[PDB]
Amino acid sequence: SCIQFTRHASDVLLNLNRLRSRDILTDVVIVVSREQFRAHKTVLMACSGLFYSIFTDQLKCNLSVINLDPEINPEGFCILLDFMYTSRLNLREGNIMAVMATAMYLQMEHVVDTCRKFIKASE
Amino acid sequence: SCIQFTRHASDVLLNLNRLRSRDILTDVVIVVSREQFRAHKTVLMACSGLFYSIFTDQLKCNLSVINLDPEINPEGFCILLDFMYTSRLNLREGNIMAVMATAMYLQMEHVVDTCRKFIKASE
Amino acid sequence: WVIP
Amino acid sequence: WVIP
Ligand SMILES: CSc1ncc(Cl)c(Nc2ccc3c(c2)CC(=O)N3)n1
Ligand SMILES: CSc1ncc(Cl)c(Nc2ccc3c(c2)CC(=O)N3)n1
Ligand SMILES: [Cl-]
Ligand SMILES: [Cl-]
Ligand SMILES: [Cl-]
Ligand SMILES: [Cl-]
C-alpha cells in the first residue's frame, strides 16, 4: 500500500553527480593510462559488474586507488563515468568503438547493447 | 547529442538498496532513541537537507555515528530511510504524523508536501 | 506521487 | 534508450 515519488531516483542521481562535481565524499581514484578519475565506490558498484566484483572483495574493498587494464581508453572511461552519474551517454561515430570496449570490460550490459545496435545500423 | 537510458536512475537506486540490505560499504550508523540504522552517507545527503548539511561539515563528515534529536520516532525514521532507497513511502493513518515530523526535521520537502496534502484530505 |  |  506504498505511494511512490516518480522523480525520486532521478533526483538522487542528480545530487550524487553534484557531490562528484564538488569532490564531496569521493572515496576512490580510478587510474586509466595515467589519467585519474575520482568517484564514489557505491555508484561505481551500482553501475558496473566489474566494480561490483572489485569492491565486494575483502581485500580490494579497502583500496583508495584502482588501476584499470592499460588497453582501456581514458576518453571511453570518462564517457561511461558521466553516464553512470547522469543516465546520459555521449555516443559518437568517433568514440563508439572505445565506448563499447570499455563497457564490455566494465560489464555495463545496457551500454554494450546500445553500442552493438548503433554499430549494426552503420554496416 | 547524448542518448538517455530511461531506467538507469531506478536501476542505480535498486542496486544501492541491495548494498544496504547486505550491509555493503555502509559508512555511518544513525541512532534514533537507541535504535540503530546503517546507511550510506552519500544516499542520506542525496535525499535529505539535514544529512547534506551534516556530512558537508568539515568535522561531522568524519563521524561514523550520528545521534538524532530524542523527539524523532524510530518507526518514522525507518519509513523515511526505506523511501530514500526505494522511492516508496509507506504512509498510513497511524504513522502520518510521525512521518511528517521526521521529514520536516530531515528536510525532505517532497515527503512533507504529500503528508500535508493527505492530512488536509482527512479534515 | 503515484500508486506504483 | 531515448532522445532526452
Ligand atoms: C547482481 S546483485 C547487485 N547488487 C548490488 C550491486 Cl551494487 C550490483 N551491481 C552490479 C552487478 C552486475 C552488473 C551491474 C551492476 C550493471 C551490469 O550490467 N551488470 N549488483
Ligand atoms: C542543494 S545542492 C545539493 N547538492 C548535493 C546534495 Cl547531496 C544535496 N542534497 C540535498 C539538499 C537539500 C535537500 C535535499 C537534498 C532533499 C530536500 O528536500 N532538500 N543538495
Ligand atoms: Cl590504496
Ligand atoms: Cl549499463
Ligand atoms: Cl564517531
Ligand atoms: Cl523528499
- Residues contacting residue B37 through CB under 8 Å, at least 6 positions apart: B29, B30, B31, B77, B78, B81
Q: What is the resolution of this structure in A?
A: 2.0
Whether the CB-CB separation of A107 and A50 falls below 8 Å is answered with: yes
Whether the CB-CB separation of B112 and B104 falls below 8 Å is answered with: yes
**CB-count exposure of residue A104 (10 Å: 0-12, 13-18, 19+):** middle
- Alpha carbon A46 to its chain's center: 9
The Cα of B69 is separated from the nearest Cα of chain A by a number of Å equal to 24
Of A117, A99, D1, give the one whose Cα is nearest residue B6.
D1
- Give the C-alpha distances (Å, rounded to integers) separating B1 from A84, D2, D4: 17, 11, 9
Alpha helices in B23-123 (DSSP H): 41-47, 49-55, 74-86, 96-106, 109-122
User: Domain of A56?
Assistant: 1-123
**CB-count exposure of residue B21 (10 Å: 0-12, 13-18, 19+):** exposed
**Kind plus residue range of the DSSP H or E element containing B66:** strand B65-67
- Give the C-alpha distances (Å, rounded to integers) separating B103 from A45, A95, B56, B110: 29, 45, 20, 9
- Written as one letter, the residue type at B8 is H
* Helix, strand or coil, per DSSP, at residue B6: coil
Q: How many domains does chain A have?
A: 1
**Kind plus residue range of the DSSP H or E element containing A102:** helix A96-106
Residues forming a β-bridge with B89: A3
HEC profile of A16-71: HHHHHHCCCCCCEEEEECCEEEEECHHHHHHHCHHHHHHHCCCCHHHCCEEECCCC
Q: Are chains D and C in contact at 3+ CB pairs closer than 8 Å?
A: no
The domain that holds B63 is classified in CATH as 3.30.710.10
* Helix, strand or coil, per DSSP, at residue A122: helix
Q: Distance from the CA of B49 to the center of ligand 2, in angstroms? A: 5
Out of B15, B20, B21, B22, give the residue to mutate to test ligand 1, the one with the largest number of ligand atoms within 8 Å of its CB.
B15
Of A69, A53, A49, A72, give the one whose Cα is nearest residue A61.
A53
φ, ψ for residue B40 (rounded to 5)?
Answer: -100, 125
Q: Which three cell numbers stand for residue A95?
A: 568514440
Q: Which three cell numbers stand for residue A37?
A: 578519475
Chain A residues with beta carbon closer than 8 angstroms to that of D1? 89, 114
* Helix, strand or coil, per DSSP, at residue A87: coil
Q: What is the C-alpha separation between A30 and A34, in angstroms, rounded?
A: 10
In terms of CA atoms, which chain B residue is nearest residue D2? B4
How many other CB atoms sit within 10 Å of the CB of residue B8? 24
The Cα of B1 is separated from the nearest Cα of chain D by a number of Å equal to 8
Q: What is the C-alpha separation between B43 and B85, in angstroms, rounded?
A: 8
- Residues contacting residue A62 through CB under 8 Å, at least 6 positions apart: none
Q: What is the C-alpha separation between A116 and A87, in angstroms, rounded?
A: 18
